[PDB]
Design an enzyme around this catalytic site. Structure first.
Site, PDB file in Angstrom:
ATOM      1  N   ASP A  45      -4.439 -12.104 -22.595  1.00 46.58           N
ATOM      2  CA  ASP A  45      -3.170 -11.556 -22.137  1.00 46.58           C
ATOM      3  C   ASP A  45      -3.312 -10.063 -21.736  1.00 46.58           C
ATOM      4  OD1 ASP A  45      -0.203 -11.091 -22.057  1.00 46.58           O
ATOM      5  OD2 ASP A  45      -0.035 -13.015 -23.132  1.00 46.58           O
ATOM      6  N   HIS A  86       3.245  -8.515 -24.459  1.00 46.36           N
ATOM      7  CA  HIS A  86       3.146  -9.950 -24.609  1.00 46.36           C
ATOM      8  C   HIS A  86       1.987 -10.435 -25.489  1.00 46.36           C
ATOM      9  CE1 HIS A  86       3.422 -14.187 -23.711  1.00 46.36           C
ATOM     10  NE2 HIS A  86       4.729 -13.891 -23.707  1.00 46.36           N
ATOM     11  N   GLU A 128     -11.412 -13.577 -15.050  1.00 44.80           N
ATOM     12  CA  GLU A 128     -11.075 -14.807 -15.790  1.00 44.80           C
ATOM     13  C   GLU A 128     -12.295 -15.396 -16.461  1.00 44.80           C
ATOM     14  OE1 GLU A 128      -9.182 -17.499 -13.067  1.00 44.80           O
ATOM     15  OE2 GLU A 128      -7.821 -15.903 -12.392  1.00 44.80           O
ATOM     16  N   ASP A 193       9.448 -25.829 -10.270  1.00 47.19           N
ATOM     17  CA  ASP A 193       8.003 -25.940 -10.202  1.00 47.19           C
ATOM     18  C   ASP A 193       7.550 -27.234 -10.915  1.00 47.19           C
ATOM     19  OD1 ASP A 193       5.382 -25.238  -9.525  1.00 47.19           O
ATOM     20  OD2 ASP A 193       5.379 -23.357 -10.669  1.00 47.19           O
ATOM     21  N   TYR A 200      -5.053 -24.556 -14.010  1.00 49.40           N
ATOM     22  CA  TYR A 200      -5.457 -24.186 -15.365  1.00 49.40           C
ATOM     23  C   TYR A 200      -4.847 -25.169 -16.346  1.00 49.40           C
ATOM     24  CZ  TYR A 200      -6.912 -19.969 -12.999  1.00 49.40           C
ATOM     25  OH  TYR A 200      -7.527 -19.170 -12.085  1.00 49.40           O
ATOM     26  N   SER A 260       5.330 -19.515 -22.513  1.00 50.14           N
ATOM     27  CA  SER A 260       4.342 -18.511 -22.865  1.00 50.14           C
ATOM     28  C   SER A 260       4.395 -18.172 -24.394  1.00 50.14           C
ATOM     29  CB  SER A 260       4.493 -17.265 -21.977  1.00 50.14           C
ATOM     30  OG  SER A 260       5.825 -17.054 -21.529  1.00 50.14           O
TER      31      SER A 260
HETATM   32  C1  LIG Z   1       4.677  -9.944 -17.520  1.00 54.66           C
HETATM   33  N1  LIG Z   1       3.260 -10.398 -17.449  1.00 54.66           N
HETATM   34  C2  LIG Z   1       3.165 -11.875 -17.261  1.00 54.66           C
HETATM   35  C3  LIG Z   1       1.720 -12.309 -17.296  1.00 54.66           C
HETATM   36  N2  LIG Z   1       0.938 -11.593 -16.281  1.00 54.66           N
HETATM   37  C4  LIG Z   1       0.186 -12.233 -15.347  1.00 54.66           C
HETATM   38  N3  LIG Z   1      -0.500 -11.467 -14.493  1.00 54.66           N
HETATM   39  C5  LIG Z   1      -1.207 -12.115 -13.567  1.00 54.66           C
HETATM   40  C6  LIG Z   1      -1.267 -13.486 -13.507  1.00 54.66           C
HETATM   41  O1  LIG Z   1      -2.007 -14.113 -12.510  1.00 54.66           O
HETATM   42  C7  LIG Z   1      -2.955 -15.045 -12.802  1.00 54.66           C
HETATM   43  C8  LIG Z   1      -3.397 -15.754 -11.708  1.00 54.66           C
HETATM   44  C9  LIG Z   1      -4.338 -16.744 -11.913  1.00 54.66           C
HETATM   45  C10 LIG Z   1      -4.914 -17.489 -10.758  1.00 54.66           C
HETATM   46  N4  LIG Z   1      -6.216 -16.885 -10.316  1.00 54.66           N
HETATM   47  C11 LIG Z   1      -6.087 -15.532  -9.702  1.00 54.66           C
HETATM   48  C12 LIG Z   1      -7.446 -15.267  -9.068  1.00 54.66           C
HETATM   49  C13 LIG Z   1      -8.062 -16.637  -8.857  1.00 54.66           C
HETATM   50  O2  LIG Z   1      -8.325 -16.796  -7.468  1.00 54.66           O
HETATM   51  C14 LIG Z   1      -9.408 -16.002  -6.981  1.00 54.66           C
HETATM   52  C15 LIG Z   1     -10.267 -16.725  -6.007  1.00 54.66           C
HETATM   53  O3  LIG Z   1      -9.739 -17.630  -5.290  1.00 54.66           O
HETATM   54  O4  LIG Z   1     -11.483 -16.350  -5.980  1.00 54.66           O
HETATM   55  C16 LIG Z   1      -6.969 -17.655  -9.287  1.00 54.66           C
HETATM   56  C17 LIG Z   1      -4.824 -16.944 -13.189  1.00 54.66           C
HETATM   57  C18 LIG Z   1      -4.304 -16.202 -14.241  1.00 54.66           C
HETATM   58  C19 LIG Z   1      -4.807 -16.363 -15.626  1.00 54.66           C
HETATM   59  C20 LIG Z   1      -4.007 -16.037 -16.719  1.00 54.66           C
HETATM   60  C21 LIG Z   1      -4.532 -16.110 -17.994  1.00 54.66           C
HETATM   61 CL1  LIG Z   1      -3.510 -15.730 -19.344  1.00 54.66          CL
HETATM   62  C22 LIG Z   1      -5.832 -16.502 -18.233  1.00 54.66           C
HETATM   63  C23 LIG Z   1      -6.615 -16.804 -17.139  1.00 54.66           C
HETATM   64 CL2  LIG Z   1      -8.260 -17.301 -17.394  1.00 54.66          CL
HETATM   65  C24 LIG Z   1      -6.138 -16.720 -15.850  1.00 54.66           C
HETATM   66  N5  LIG Z   1      -3.386 -15.238 -14.046  1.00 54.66           N
HETATM   67  C25 LIG Z   1      -0.521 -14.178 -14.435  1.00 54.66           C
HETATM   68  N6  LIG Z   1       0.204 -13.570 -15.371  1.00 54.66           N
HETATM   69  C26 LIG Z   1       1.048 -10.131 -16.368  1.00 54.66           C
HETATM   70  C27 LIG Z   1       2.509  -9.702 -16.360  1.00 54.66           C
HETATM   71 CA   LIG Z   2       3.846 -23.359 -12.630  1.00 53.52          CA
HETATM   72 NA    NA Z   3      -4.674 -29.261 -19.442  1.00 52.40          NA
END
Ligand SMILES: C[NH+]1CCN(c2ncc(Oc3cc(C[N@@H+]4CC[C@H](OCC(=O)O)C4)cc(-c4cc(Cl)cc(Cl)c4)n3)cn2)CC1
Ligand SMILES: [Ca+2]
Ligand code: NA
Ligand SMILES: [Ca+2]
Ligand SMILES: [Ca+2]
Ligand SMILES: [Cl-]
Ligand code: NA
EC number: 3.4.21.75
Length: 473
Positions: A45, A86, A128, A193, A200, A260
């Protein structure tokens, strides 16, 4: 003999213990002697307040890292707006210290807890992968509460490095038993959605969790999908209570919300289960969740009995997690046989979608071969199709035992003309069924618009074993 926690906010943790039978049955696991000792959970997070009075006692630097700044310290970035709170909230749900006169308790209040500071910056594929692959011979369970945008129009999943981290985790992590990745199914409910569009949660390697309100309803933010396995309680309307946990700046919150907040409660239940049997594999954990989850008192218009007599819902999976039942069944659990994978290419030519398309196929599930499956675990329909307005599609998959899984529901905000490029729509609803026989894929245009497109590939990928079935429920 067992004495329940005396923490000031433990009576407000209605989901842990309650006389009304509307809880996660965690006191039953605690009375059996399971509180999480020796288990290690990590929260992926925005960081963890490692010096919080209710977290310091269980904090583990070995379960932590700051991937955003590239250092070992996952301390959140403090801002006047308290934006990076969070992770601290999630960490307290899993392992807040018990009997210390502070806030409440974690589900696994004697487990070690850490955090990966990875969401406070650009979330790239490399970020990630380094988070999912952090210390896999020390961290037992990873809890992730977020993923791609819950705007009801995104189709996205782990790119190469993150998908390789999931593979390495379930194969070599935890001494070959496999990393346990617990995931929140999403908060895109008001955007209509459908969580199979999030790679994931839709992954077989993640143990996906949805939410139920205190009165047993489907919260406003919930996403329905066939990849979800089970549910934990979380927030709902303003007459319903919320999640009580540790908060940023050494505070206590009674208003932690969403799916979440459900994933960390599940990570805590999974930590108690892993204490009851350290030899459970990543697949054994998913089997225990399917067998012990309780549909009772969870309200939904789609509850259906699958081929082996279990009730399953697209909102709740197999139902509410039951910690007491999970720990009892884990103690004498027999390790499942190695995972088999049967690949069945269904199409002999492209097919026009039009208003409606039904594709039927009678399969043998790799009969006579080492990958023969008589006991299904996950099933995927990997589809490649073009369509002028993606959100108008609704896709269903019926198994030979009559189990109708919604692979994709209509997404009104999805106007994309990009279709699906080998998207692995997964379902857990046919778990333990014999996959031999007729499978039916149905693709329909739910709108009145003259939409058009073509299905060019349908690979039915079955995972499972060929032994050890129980008598149907
Ligand atoms: C208020 N708060 C709310 C939470 N938050 C937030 N911030 C960003 C966010 O976005 C993503 C997006 C992706 C898709 N990914 C993105 C890049 C990859 O694509 C690249 C490519 O194609 O090479 C695919 C994955 C994840 C992710 C989240 C967790 Cl927890 C663990 C792992 Cl492992 C991955 N988070 C989600 N939540 C912060 C603000
Ligand atoms: Ca969704
Ligand atoms: Na699953
Ligand atoms: Ca840092
Ligand atoms: Ca406490
Ligand atoms: Cl695979
Ligand atoms: Na069958």
């Amino acid at each position: 003999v067992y004495q329940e926690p005396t923490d000031p906010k433990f009576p407000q943790q209605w989901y842990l213990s309650g006389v009304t039978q509307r809880d996660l049955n965690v006191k039953a696991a605690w009375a059996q002697g399971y509180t999480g000792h020796g288990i290690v959970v990590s929260i992926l997070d925005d960081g963890i307040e490692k010096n919080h009075p209710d977290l310091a006692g269980n904090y583990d630097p070995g379960a932590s890292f700051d991937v955003n700044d590239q250092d070992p310290d996952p301390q959140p970035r403090y801002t006047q707006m308290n934006d990076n709170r969070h992770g601290t909230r999630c960490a307290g749900e899993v392992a807040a210290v018990a009997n210390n006169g502070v806030c409440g308790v974690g589900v696994a209040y004697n487990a070690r807890i850490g955090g990966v500071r990875m969401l406070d910056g650009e979330v790239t594929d490399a970020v990630e992968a380094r988070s999912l692959g952090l210390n896999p011979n020390h961290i037992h369970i990873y809890s992730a509460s977020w993923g791609p945008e819950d705007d009801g129009k995104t189709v996205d999943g782990p790119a190469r490095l993150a998908e390789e981290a999931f593979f390495r985790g379930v194969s070599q992590g935890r001494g070959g038993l496999g990393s346990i990745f617990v995931w929140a199914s999403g908060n895109g409910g008001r955007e209509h959605d459908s969580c199979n569009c999030d790679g994931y949660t839709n992954s077989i390697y993640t143990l996906s969790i949805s939410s139920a309100t205190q009165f047993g309803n489907v919260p406003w933010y919930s996403e329905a999908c066939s990849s979800t396995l089970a549910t934990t309680y979380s927030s709902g309307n303003q007459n319903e209570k919320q999640i009580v946990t540790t908060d940023l700046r050494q505070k206590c919150t009674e208003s932690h919300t969403g799916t979440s907040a459900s994933a960390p409660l599940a990570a805590g239940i999974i930590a108690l289960t892993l204490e009851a049997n350290k030899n459970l594999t990543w697949r054994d954990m998913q089997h225990l969740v399917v067998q012990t989850s309780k549909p009772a008192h969870l309200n939904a218009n789609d509850w259906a009995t699958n081929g082996v007599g279990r009730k399953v819902s697209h909102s709740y999976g197999y139902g509410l997690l039951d910690a007491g039942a999970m720990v009892a069944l884990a103690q004498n659990w027999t390790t499942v046989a190695p995972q088999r994978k049967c690949i069945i290419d269904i199409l002999t030519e492209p097919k026009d979608i039009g208003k409606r398309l039904e594709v039927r196929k009678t399969v043998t599930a790799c009969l006579g071969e080492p990958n023969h499956i008589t006991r299904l675990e996950h099933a995927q329909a990997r589809l490649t199709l073009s369509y002028n307005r993606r959100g108008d599609l609704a896709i269903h998959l019926v198994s030979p035992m009559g189990t109708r899984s919604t692979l994709l529901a209509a997404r009104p905000h999805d106007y994309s003309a990009d279709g699906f490029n080998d998207w692995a729509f997964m379902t857990t609803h046919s778990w333990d069924e014999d996959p031999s026989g007729e499978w039916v894929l149905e693709i329909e245009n739910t709108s009145e618009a003259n939409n058009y497109g073509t299905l060019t590939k349908f690979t039915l990928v079955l995972y499972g074993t060929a032994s050890g079935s129980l008598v149907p429920r």
